[PDB]
């Protein structure tokens, strides 16, 4: 994995020694070359995971998250170079350094062979994200949002540190490859109940769980666009990745410890979709949609069937691409009307027809239109939760109805109807904006052709 | 009730609006033209009976129970004209009513496609930006203290001056673009 | 009563300006000024090339794999002769005729 | 479909409808003939004239505008303003 860590570190002298008009182009070009190179991780096998060294490995779960992570950096550089155009050159290089450094932390977060290295990288991903939100966020609430983002994650993760060091003292190792063969059953006791909570609540905060999601519609809203892209596309999926690793160790106690959290997520996907029906902020509507989509991934990890893991990793990749594109569409209107109020700019299909086509396709992937991998992940989670209990089909179907409702309500509100008369700075769509939309959508549609590379370790 | 010019509806205006609503809903009930014409003359007689009524309280009471009459005898799906609100073709062409300022954002290669149109548009934009400060100072010298009482706009008074706030009334889009 | 004189004067002036605007919305005879830019080709390029492509695909990649194109077996009646065997199906029993 | 309206054609059709109204004789009628001052009509007659205009041209005149159209020239000017004639 060192052949990806070293070029990501070499993006730092590439962004600090570049000419002052070349610091976006060079980082975009070489991060696209790293994203091209990311496809060598598809050397996967049906029995063995691609095990590089004592420190790094990549199974078929970490590999799509890695390719999505290394693909997200040039798109964040494209999205964030217009509103940081008038920035100081040094602060612009600091923003690009925080993006590169967050990618550097993530690509060795997902490949961490040993779990405390995963914890160090996992909590290292707070610091560039916190700096991006609280420094290049736009409104006043970015400082409070950075507080909530920091102090939910550390409140969840500092019991996780004690849990992992306890496993290190008991099993003798936190290597995940050794713990695939030295895993012992975790019986019913109060000690093992709080063991389960300490191993799971950090990732429940990072997904986010319903009831603990209150960091998210302030951190995802008050960030800039690159912060919103990385938070929606990768940093929620760190939680699901950690769950799919750490639920190896939590059996059979998960089979009754999962019930309150399965209730919280099965009811939170209804409640947050209902919240999306009544949002005035478009960016907050996309934030609560992200909570609504990650609730299904939480249920799919907690029921731990193979169909549920396949649907959960497919839905994680699909939601990363879809939510990143929805935030970029929201930014493309915010850079014209300078307001996140959804009812302000109306009738935009009369003005921006191809951008409205991108709105249509992202709203169709948001409502899980087949054969998109959105529908593949959605559908496999619904199959596995039906096999779990036959009455969960009511909640899954009601969630799908409300999901279609807020997706097409977002589309109709922003794009349809009579246009707003007093708004006259609606520029045509720039080539940068349409290129950003297509670089989100076209991989998301091409992955419907060959979807087996995003279905996890147990496809 | 709700008007841009007046603050209320007079009694006479309420009677006329009732008479028009009653004839339209009657025409919905009485589809054929001769039969509608018969019953519309009967309704005209029912309005001409209490026409010369000088007691405003008695006329107000007759207006109120005539509204109860109309409410009990309205067509549930009355005939609406197509471009009238509620009609099957209402606000259909609003997706084709692109505003005038979107022509300013065209590329010059498609402004070169219509040279005389944009050359004739620049004198409209010039005329508007010389009319603007004069029509602002026209509005501020005629409006009383405390702001305007009604939404009525005053016309232009000098020669060479355009009426105040004329641009988004004149340069509104057509109904069939 | 109808309009005030101010309202009629304003509608007259707005009407004149509106009609000038709409008359200016006409085209010139030279506009739009444009930049300077096989009878049965449909049945060739839209059928005869796709039937070639799809028949090549189905013949040498789909029917080469098992159970891809699986066909319901042909219906056999009394009196028929099998082409693969030469076997003649014996006919039905002679009917207890009803009419 | 939908042939364009001219001010000449609109004025001819409006005066044509008002000449088919028995409370207006056609030899007095002109485009400036005020319905209450000159032709001596009631406000009920004005509401019926507006409804005949609506049935003639196929669109509804709202009552805030229908209470103010008191001569045929005002009616022709309003139908011009709502149909955008002489483009």
């Amino acid at each position: 994995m060192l052949k990806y860590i070293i070029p990501t570190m070499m993006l730092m002298p590439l962004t600090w020694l570049s000419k002052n008009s070349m610091i976006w182009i060079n980082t975009t070009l070489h991060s696209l070359l790293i994203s091209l190179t990311s496809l060598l991780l598809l050397n996967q096998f049906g029995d063995n995971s691609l095990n590089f060294s004592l420190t790094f490995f990549s199974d078929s779960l970490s590999t799509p998250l890695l390719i999505l992570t290394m693909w997200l950096l040039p798109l964040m550089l494209m999205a964030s170079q217009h509103h940081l155009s008038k920035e100081n050159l040094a602060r612009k290089k600091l923003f690009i350094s925080m993006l590169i450094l967050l990618q550097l932390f993530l690509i060795m977060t997902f490949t961490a062979t040993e779990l405390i290295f995963f914890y160090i990288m996992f909590e290292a991903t707070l610091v560039p994200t916190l700096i991006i939100i609280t420094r290049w966020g736009n409104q006043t609430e970015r400082l409070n949002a950075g507080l909530y983002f920091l102090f939910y994650t550390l409140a969840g993760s500092l019991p996780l540190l004690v849990a992992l060091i306890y496993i290190q003292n008991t099993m003798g190792s936190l290597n995940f490859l050794i713990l695939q063969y030295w895993v012992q059953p975790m019986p019913n006791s109060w000690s093992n109940t709080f063991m389960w909570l300490a191993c799971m609540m950090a990732f429940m905060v990072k997904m986010p769980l319903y009831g603990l999601h209150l960091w998210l519609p302030k951190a995802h809203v008050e960030a800039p666009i690159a912060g919103s892209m990385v938070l929606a596309a990768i940093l929620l999926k760190l939680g699901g990745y950690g769950m799919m690793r750490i639920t190896l160790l939590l059996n059979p106690i998960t089979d009754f410890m999962a019930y309150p959290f399965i209730m919280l997520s099965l009811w939170g996907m209804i409640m947050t979709s209902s919240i999306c029906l009544r949002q005035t902020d478009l960016k907050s509507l996309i934030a609560y949609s992200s909570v609504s989509h990650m609730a299904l991934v939480i249920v799919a990890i907690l029921i731990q069937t193979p169909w549920s893991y396949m649907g959960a990793t497919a839905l994680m990749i699909a939601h990363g691409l879809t939510s990143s594109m929805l935030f970029c569409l929201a930014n493309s209107n915010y850079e014209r009307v300078h307001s996140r109020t959804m009812i302000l700019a109306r009738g935009l299909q009369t003005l921006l027809p191809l951008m409205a086509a991108w709105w249509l396709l992202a709203s169709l992937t948001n409502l899980a239109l087949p054969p998109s991998i959105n529908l593949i992940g959605e559908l496999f989670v619904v199959m596995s939760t039906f096999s779990w209990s036959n009455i969960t089909i009511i909640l899954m179907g009601l969630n799908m109805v409300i999901t279609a409702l807020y997706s097409l309500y977002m589309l109709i509100t922003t794009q349809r109807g009579k246009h707003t008369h007093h708004i006259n700075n609606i520029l045509p769509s720039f080539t940068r904006e349409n290129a950003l939309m297509s670089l989100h959508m076209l991989p998301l549609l091409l992955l419907s052709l060959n979807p087996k590379i995003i279905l996890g370790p147990l496809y | 009730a709700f008007l841009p010019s007046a603050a209320y509806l007079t009694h006479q205006q309420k009677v006329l609006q009732l008479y028009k609503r009653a004839l339209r809903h009657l025409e919905s009930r009485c589809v054929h033209r001769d039969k509608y014409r018969y019953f519309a003359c009967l309704l005209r007689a029912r309005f001409d009976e209490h026409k010369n009524e000088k007691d405003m309280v008695k006329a107000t009471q007759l207006l109120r129970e005539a509204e109860k009459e109309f409410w009990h005898g309205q067509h549930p799906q009355p005939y609406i004209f197509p471009e009238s609100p509620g009609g099957t073709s209402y606000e259909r062409y609003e997706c084709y009513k692109v505003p005038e300022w979107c022509l300013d954002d065209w590329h010059p290669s498609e402004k070169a496609m219509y040279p005389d149109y944009f050359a004739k548009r620049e004198q409209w934009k010039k005329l508007r930006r010389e009319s603007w400060e004069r029509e602002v100072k026209q509005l501020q010298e005629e409006t009383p203290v405390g702001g305007p009482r009604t939404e009525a706009l005053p016309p232009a008074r000098k020669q060479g001056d355009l009426p105040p706030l004329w641009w988004h009334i004149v340069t509104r889009p057509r109904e069939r673009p | 009563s109808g309009y005030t004189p101010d309202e009629k004067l304003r509608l007259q002036q707005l009407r004149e300006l509106r009609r000038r605007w709409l008359k200016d919305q006409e085209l010139s005879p030279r506009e739009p000024v444009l930049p300077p830019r096989r009878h049965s080709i449909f049945a060739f390029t839209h059928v005869l090339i796709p039937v070639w492509i799809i028949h090549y695909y189905l013949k040498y990649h789909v029917t080469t794999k098992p159970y891809t194109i699986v066909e319901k077996k042909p219906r056999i009646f009394p009196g028929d002769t099998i082409l693969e065997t030469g076997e003649v199906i014996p006919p039905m029993k002679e009917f207890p005729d009803q009419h | 479909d939908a042939p364009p309206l001219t001010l000449e054609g609109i004025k001819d059709r409006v005066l044509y409808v008002l000449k088919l109204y028995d409370k207006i004789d056609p030899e007095k009628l002109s485009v400036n003939s005020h319905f209450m001052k000159d032709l001596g009509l009631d406000s009920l007659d004005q509401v019926e004239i507006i409804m005949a205009m609506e049935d003639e041209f196929g669109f509804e005149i709202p009552d805030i505008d229908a209470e103010k159209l008191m001569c045929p020239q005002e009616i022709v000017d309003y139908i011009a303003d709502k149909k955008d004639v002489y483009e």
């Binding site: 921006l352 045509p428 769509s429 | 979107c102 | 006409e26 | -």
Partner: peptide, 13 residues
């Protein structure tokens, strides 16, 4: 004749 100009947003980009 009497062709009318059709105001439409900028389709060049």
């Amino acid at each position: 004749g009497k062709r009318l100009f059709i105001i439409k947003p900028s389709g060049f980009y």
